[PDB]
């Protein structure tokens, strides 16, 4: 397991975020003030469209950011 802490990875058109333990984060995350949802299987950010999460529809920008909240 490679050290890779408290940062994003942009890989093959997908977006991942790594916590302090060098693992890809899943589910809802606030990163630098912005909201993201990382899919529980792939760890990829919900991005570039509308997604239903727990019965609520949200929009995520291409950068993965949830439109307001």
């Amino acid at each position: 397991a490679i050290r890779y802490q408290n940062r994003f990875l942009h890989l093959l058109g997908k977006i991942y975020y790594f916590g302090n333990n060098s693992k890809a984060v899943t589910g809802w995350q606030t990163i630098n003030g912005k909201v993201y949802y990382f899919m529980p299987d792939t760890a990829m950010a919900a991005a570039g469209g509308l997604f239903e999460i727990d019965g609520v529809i949200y929009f995520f920008g291409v950068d993965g950011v949830k439109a307001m909240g």
Partner: nanobody
Amino acid sequence: EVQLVESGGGSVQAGGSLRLSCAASAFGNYMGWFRQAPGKEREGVAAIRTGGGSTYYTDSVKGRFTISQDKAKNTVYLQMNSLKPEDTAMYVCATAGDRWHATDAFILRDFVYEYWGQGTQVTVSS
């Protein structure tokens, strides 16, 4: 909603020192010290990541201020040496919940913090 309480503020002469304490009901991923002078915005001063203890500082306090944690006592500390008039401010500590993260370049920006304490006053006289 994490509770934070600061202490150790005071009046001191320029060149002197203070040590602030921040008691927290829990630590997030990071603990920060901010300060706010009259009429200015809050500015982040120092931050520590609670896993491993990496420390970050704003350029104006490097070599003067030191941030540290005691996880046993759920307390974070700011040792403030070689104080100057421009260090006068209300000092407040902050943290965030479990799914809150900051990258190195943002760990001293106020918008990566969710929970704030009350403030302890620091006044540096000439």
